[PDB]
Structure formats: structure tokens, C-alpha cells
């Protein structure tokens, strides 16, 4: 397991968060190896999944499309991150896969699973058993949300992950059908003074509602795995949301369409950059081949940061500090990913999506960004008050900045930010349980 070594990805909002749990009588090492190998089939193409009846999430709607997965194990602190699900849905985890080895009844097991996790949408479990009896085999293969594989996860993992996607699409479609008749008010309006307003130390209703609904429709498509229609929805979302001057939601919409740009580039399809984004943000209509994609991404990112800044003086529609900081981390790691090659090629497109770090490499002359723009951008992270948010945000921010500086080759800066991490972890007013990665952290320092 890899706990305090976060390094986000710019396609993270497209990635699907899935919480994994050790049902039964497992050990730490065996479970860690199991989940690590299970986190190797997270590119389930939409071609190999069989279709679904409903149209707006049918896997038989686009020949390409990778349908990422993001397997994780940390139960993030709910009841405070619950509030900002209306603003964007991908924050909420959706599908549970539970590893089980006890030869126990799947029906009662998943019954108690659902009783424990009412909030989550798509539960399912997988048996890591060595030759379970035929009586259990009949019961499990009768039902869909229960599967079985031999220990070490090497029997039918591909088809299993195909089917998990198949149930997940149906479950998300049910969720959206239940969810498409809501007001979708901003998290500031939802919580009042429950989310910090990012204290720095540096005819107007129906159209807004329609724009927000079109946004969330496009965002659900983006998470579901059909992206050309997601782009076509994001265009008419942004153009309608610009005139109503709702800066906060427009920022996330612009972020989403930028993610669409990157991932369609990764899939290697042609697409014109729309006149609306070209008008709202300059480039300094036209095919992607006649423009350098990273500079486009950079100016888009800068403009959405500008809108998040411009959306602070409104008391109940202010962008939450968690979203602001996480987006900043996302752009910073994107810049570091770009700063490894003069050519913006399939290699780095694979790196950014698959999250392989490739520590240390030969520097080619004249990379995309210099090694001062990255540092100057990372200095923006300290401009916001950091020692007031809680430990998840603190550790994620300081750990990814440490990794950023390590890739840039600023060893003593990495030492500085790791020291900041250590004091921040010390100052928490709650007991913390031992992990074998604090060992690695102290050794590295």
C-alpha cells in the first residue's frame, strides 16, 4: 500500500474512485499484494463490455473509451466532503469491491455490507478462495454482484473487471435518473459556514439552473466514459453559463472541458477547439494539430484559477478551499509531467494517465516549461492559509509538493516541505495508527 505518497493526475475527475475492503480473515501483506495486483486492470475498454438498455450511458455508444478505475483503500472523512457532491459528483466514491476469503454466504455478507455503507451506490464482492465447493459455486455464479477467483487474483480478473464496469454503468444510470430533478445549489449555500472560504495571505434563475444541469449532465458522461458527447455537452454548458455570470460553476465546467481535450488527445481523435473556449480564453475553427496542446491547457488552467479568484466576494457561492487546493495540485503535477521532454508525445500522455513516475532521467534541451515557472506556480500553494485545514488535505498537499520538488531536482526544497509535513502531522490533535510508510518518510528525510 502507498499511503502518504500522493501524486494526483489531471484526468483524476475522469478516474473512478473505488473503495476496497478486506472481508474475512486476511493479513496485511496478502491483502496489500491482492489490491496491488487488482490495481493493474484499470483500463477496461468499452468494447469488451456488453451493452445496456438505456441510451445516455450505453457502452455501445462509442468504439473507443478507456473507462478508468482508481482503486483506493482510505475511507475519507465523510459528512464534510459530502456537501460538495452537488457541485461535482466524482468526489463521491460509487462502487465497492470487497475481497472476501471465508467461504461464507455472499447474500448475508453483502447484506451487512449494504447496511454498513448505505451512502454508496454499487456494492459487490469477490471470493479469493482456493477451490470453493460446487454448492457455493452455483449460488455465486447465479448472481452478478458476486464473483470468485483463485488466490493471488489470476483466474478471471479481466472478465471480472469487465462485469464490474457493466454493473457500475447501470448503477450510475439509476443514480442519475434519481438525481436529475434536484435544484443543485452551491456548497456554500448548502453548508453556510461549514466550508472555509480559502482565506488567502497574498431573469437570472432559470438559465442558471439549466446551465448547471447541462454541466452535471456532461460531468456524469465524463465520469461514465463517453467523451465526445461530453465535449458537445460542455460546449453548450459553458456558453450558456458565461452570460449568467456564475463564475464558480463555470470554472469547473472549463476544467472539465480541458480534461476532455487532454483525454481525447490521448485517445487520438481529431476535434476542433470550440469558438466559445477560444473567445473566453485567448490562445496567444482550428484543428488540435495546429496548436501546441500544453500551452492551451496552461492558459485554460490560468483562466479557471482567475475565475475561482473572482468568485470570492459572494458570500454563499464561494469556491471551497479544498477544491481550490486540489485543483492547484492537479495543475502543478501536470506541469511537472510536461517538464520531462521536448516532445509532447504518446509516452508522456501514457505517463500522465497511468501514473508512472520514472524517477530521474536524462534532461533534454529546452523542455516545455522552464524550471522556474514550475517553482513560481508552486509558490502559489503557500499563498493560501495551510495550517487550518485538516490532515488529509495537509498531507496530500505537502506530499505531492515533495514529489514535485524531487522531480524538479530541488533536494533541499524537498527537505523543507517534508519538514513542513512532519510538523503538520505532529500538530494534529488526534491519535494516528502506525503504517510502514512513515518508516520510508523518516528514512527519506
Amino acid at each position: 500500500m502507498n499511503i502518504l505518497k500522493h501524486f494526483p493526475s489531471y484526468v483524476g475527475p475522469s478516474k473512478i474512485r473505488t473503495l476496497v475492503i478486506p472481508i474475512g480473515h486476511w493479513t496485511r501483506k496478502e491483502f496489500n499484494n491482492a489490491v496491488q495486483k487488482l490495481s493493474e486492470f484499470n483500463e477496461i475498454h468499452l468494447s469488451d463490455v456488453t451493452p445496456i438498455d438505456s441510451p445516455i450511458f450505453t457502452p455501445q455508444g462509442f468504439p473507443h473509451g478507456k473507462l478508468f478505475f482508481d482503486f483506493l483503500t482510505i475511507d475519507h472523512d465523510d459528512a464534510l466532503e459530502l456537501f460538495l457532491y452537488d457541485f461535482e459528483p466524482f468526489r463521491k466514491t460509487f462502487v465497492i469491491i470487497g475481497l472476501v476469503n471465508d467461504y461464507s454466504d455472499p447474500l448475508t455478507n453483502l447484506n451487512f455490507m449494504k447496511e454498513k455503507y448505505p451512502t454508496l451506490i454499487s456494492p459487490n464482492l469477490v471470493y479469493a478462495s482456493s477451490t470453493p465447493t460446487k454448492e457455493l459455486e452455483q449460488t455465486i455464479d447465479t448472481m452478478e454482484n458476486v464473483f470468485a477467483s483463485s488466490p493471488d487474483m489470476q483466474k478471471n480478473i479481466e472478465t471480472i473487471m469487465c462485469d464490474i464496469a457493466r454493473n457500475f454503468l447501470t448503477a450510475l444510470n439509476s443514480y442519475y435518473s434519481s438525481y436529475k430533478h434536484v435544484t443543485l445549489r452551491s456548497p456554500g449555500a448548502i453548508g453556510g459556514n461549514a466550508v472555509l472560504k480559502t482565506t488567502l495571505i497574498r431573469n437570472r434563475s432559470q438559465q442558471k439552473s439549466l446551465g448547471r444541469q447541462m454541466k452535471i449532465l456532461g460531468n456524469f458522461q465524463l465520469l461514465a466514459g463517453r467523451y465526445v458527447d461530453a465535449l458537445n455537452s460542455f460546449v453548450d454548458a459553458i456558453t450558456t453559463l458565461y452570460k449568467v455570470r456564475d463564475y464558480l460553476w463555470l470554472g469547473s465546467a472549463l476544467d472539465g472541458i480541458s480534461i476532455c481535450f487532454l483525454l481525447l488527445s490521448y485517445l487520438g481523435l481529431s476535434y476542433q477547439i470550440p469558438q466559445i473556449v477560444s473567445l473566453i480564453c485567448p490562445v496567444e475553427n482550428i484543428d488540435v494539430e495546429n496548436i501546441n496542446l500544453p500551452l492551451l491547457i496552461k492558459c485554460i488552467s490560468d483562466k479557471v484559477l482567475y475565475y475561482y479568484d473572482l468568485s470570492l466576494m459572494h458570500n454563499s457561492e464561494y469556491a471551497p478551499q479544498v477544491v481550490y487546493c486540489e485543483f492547484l495540485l492537479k495543475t502543478l503535477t501536470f506541469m511537472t509531467s510536461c517538464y520531462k521532454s521536448s516532445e509532447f508525445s504518446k509516452d508522456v500522455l501514457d505517463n500522465i494517465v497511468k501514473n508512472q513516475h520514472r524517477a530521474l532521467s536524462d534532461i533534454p534541451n529546452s523542455p516545455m516549461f522552464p524550471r522556474f515557472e514550475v517553482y513560481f506556480y508552486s509558490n502559489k500553494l503557500f499563498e493560501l492559509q495551510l495550517k487550518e485545514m485538516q490532515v488529509e488535505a495537509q498531507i496530500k498537499i505537502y506530499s505531492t509538493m515533495a514529489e514535485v520538488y524531487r522531480l524538479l531536482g530541488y533536494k533541499r526544497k524537498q527537505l523543507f516541505v517534508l519538514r513542513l509535513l512532519m510538523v503538520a502531522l505532529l500538530a494534529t490533535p488526534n491519535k494516528i495508527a502506525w503504517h510502514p510508510d512513515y518508516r520510508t518518510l523518516i528514512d527519506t528525510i
Binding site: 493479513t27 482510505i74 475511507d75 451487512f112 488526534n430 495508527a433 503504517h435 510502514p436
Partner: peptide, 22 residues
């Protein structure tokens, strides 16, 4: 030794491997 002692244990079922806050 703690390093090997924690490697093999009985995990609390129906719970994550490692939670942060109480």
C-alpha cells in the same frame, strides 16, 4: 519486532486497512 509483527495480523473485517480521523 514491530516491522514483521504488523506484517501478519487479523484485519478488522468490514473496515478499511487504515483510517485517518476518528
Amino acid at each position: 519486532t514491530l516491522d514483521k509483527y504488523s506484517s501478519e495480523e487479523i484485519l478488522p473485517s468490514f473496515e478499511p486497512v487504515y483510517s485517518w480521523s476518528s
